[PDB]
C-alpha cells in the first residue's frame, strides 16, 4: 500500500509545458528586478529560491560526529534460550 | 586612406531622402516617394525599401556620384547607415506618439522600455536590430554591373553585384535566428546576443557584476519571446 500511494503521488505530480514566469512584489539581486521562475509553480509560496541547487557547508574532519557499531541483531529462538539458560 | 565620419554621410542620406522627386502626372505638384514610404513604415503599413542607386546617381544633388560609388563599393556597411537614418526620420516624423503593437516582440519592447523607466542607456541596453524593425535593399540597372555567374571572382567580394539566370533548387521557408535573448536565473538580468553568420555559441555563465560578485553561480535560460527570428 505504501508502494502504491507514493508512486501515484510521484506521477501525478508532473505537469506537461513550461513557459517562464514573474513574481510581482518580490525583489531580485540586481537594480530594477522582479524574481522570475522557470516552471508552473500552483502558488508563490511553493518557491524555493532554488536552494536545491546550493552545496551544503562541512564541518572539518576532526569535528563531526562518529557513531560506535556494535553488530546487533535479533537471533533466532534456539540461540537466545541457550543464552538465557 | 578610410572614412569613418559616419555623421557626414548620414546627412548626405538624409539629404537624399528630402529632396528627390517626381512631377504630379497632373502638373499639380511634386511627390517625394521615398519619404512617404517612410512614412508607411511609421505608421506600420510596410516593412522594407527598396532603393535604387541610379536614382541617387542621377540626383540633383552635391556629392550624389561619390555616395553611389561608395553605397556599391562597401554596400555591407552602408545598410546600417540607411537604417539609421530610417530610424531619424521615423523618430522625426512620429515625436511623442508610439507606433503600435502588432506582435510580441512588440509588445515586449514597448512594456519593457516603459518598465526600464519606471538615448544612452537605451542604446547601451539594446542591440540596434532589436530596435530597429523594418528592412532595406538595394538595386541596380545600369549594364555596368551585369554579370554572369562565371564572373564574380575575388574583386567582387563586398560589393553590389547584379545578374540575371534561371532558378534550379528552393527551398521552404524556415526560421532563421537573429537575436537571442537570455535571462538569469537568481539576479534577473538579461543578456542580448546578435548572430551574425550560419553559427553562434551560446554564453554559459551570467556576466552581470551583482551576480559575479556574489558568486551566485545562475545559469542563463534562453528566451524565444524576446529573441528575434527573420523568414
Ligand atoms: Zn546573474
Same mark, same amino acid.
Given at each position: ?10 506521477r501525478?505530480?508532473f ?7 514573474t513574481?510581482?512584489?518580490?525583489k531580485?539581486?540586481? #537594480?530594477?528586478?522582479s524574481?522570475?521562475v ?5 502558488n508563490?509560496?511553493?518557491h524555493?529560491?532554488?536552494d ?12 563531526? =560526529? %562518529?557513531?560506535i557499531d ?7 529462538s534456539?540461540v537466545?534460550?541457550?543464552?538465557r539458560? | 586612406? @578610410? ?17 528627390? @522627386? !517626381?512631377?504630379?502626372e497632373?502638373?499639380?505638384?511634386k511627390?517625394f516617394? +521615398?519619404?512617404?514610404? !517612410? %512614412?508607411?513604415?511609421a505608421?506600420?503599413?510596410?516593412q ?13 544633388? =552635391? ?13 555591407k ?6 537604417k ?15 507606433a503600435?503593437?502588432?506582435? #510580441?516582440?512588440?509588445? +515586449? ?11 544612452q ?16 535593399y ?34 521552404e521557408?524556415? =526560421?532563421?535566428?537573429?537575436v ?6 537568481t539576479?534577473?538580468?538579461? !543578456?542580448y546576443? =546578435?548572430?551574425?553568420?550560419?553559427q ?5 555563465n551570467?556576466?552581470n ?11 542563463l ?6 529573441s528575434?527570428?527573420v523568414?
Amino acid at each position: 500500500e505504501n508502494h502504491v500511494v507514493k508512486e501515484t503521488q510521484k506521477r501525478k505530480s508532473f505537469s506537461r509545458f513550461g513557459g517562464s514566469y514573474t513574481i510581482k512584489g518580490l525583489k531580485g539581486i540586481s #537594480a530594477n528586478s522582479s524574481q522570475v521562475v522557470f516552471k508552473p509553480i500552483q502558488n508563490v509560496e511553493k518557491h524555493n529560491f532554488l536552494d536545491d541547487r546550493k552545496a551544503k557547508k562541512r564541518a572539518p574532519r576532526n569535528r563531526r =560526529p %562518529f557513531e560506535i557499531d556494535t553488530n546487533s541483531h535479533f537471533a533466532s529462538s534456539e540461540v537466545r534460550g541457550m543464552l538465557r539458560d | 586612406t @578610410y572614412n569613418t565620419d559616419w555623421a557626414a554621410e548620414k546627412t548626405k542620406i538624409r539629404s537624399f531622402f528630402d529632396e528627390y @522627386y !517626381v512631377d504630379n502626372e497632373d502638373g499639380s505638384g511634386k511627390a517625394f516617394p +521615398y519619404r512617404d514610404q !517612410v %512614412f508607411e513604415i511609421a505608421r506600420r503599413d510596410k516593412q522594407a525599401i527598396v532603393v535604387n542607386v541610379d536614382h541617387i546617381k542621377e540626383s540633383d544633388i =552635391p556629392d550624389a556620384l561619390e555616395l553611389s560609388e561608395a553605397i556599391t563599393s562597401n554596400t555591407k556597411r552602408y545598410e546600417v547607415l540607411f537604417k539609421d537614418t530610417i530610424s531619424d526620420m521615423i523618430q522625426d516624423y512620429l515625436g511623442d506618439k508610439q507606433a503600435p503593437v502588432i506582435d #510580441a516582440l512588440d509588445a +515586449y519592447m514597448f512594456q519593457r522600455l516603459h518598465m526600464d523607466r519606471n538615448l544612452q542607456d537605451k542604446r547601451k541596453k539594446y542591440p540596434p536590430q532589436l530596435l530597429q524593425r523594418f528592412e532595406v535593399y538595394f538595386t541596380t540597372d545600369d549594364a555596368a554591373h551585369e554579370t554572369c555567374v562565371r564572373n564574380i571572382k575575388a574583386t567582387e567580394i563586398g560589393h553590389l553585384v547584379s545578374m540575371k539566370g534561371v532558378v534550379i533548387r528552393a527551398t521552404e521557408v524556415k =526560421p532563421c535566428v537573429e537575436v537571442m535573448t537570455y535571462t538569469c536565473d537568481t539576479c534577473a538580468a538579461e !543578456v542580448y546576443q =546578435p548572430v551574425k553568420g550560419m553559427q553562434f555559441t551560446p554564453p554559459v555563465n551570467c556576466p552581470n557584476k551583482e551576480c559575479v560578485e556574489a558568486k551566485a553561480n545562475g545559469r542563463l535560460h534562453m528566451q524565444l519571446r524576446g529573441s528575434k527570428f527573420v523568414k
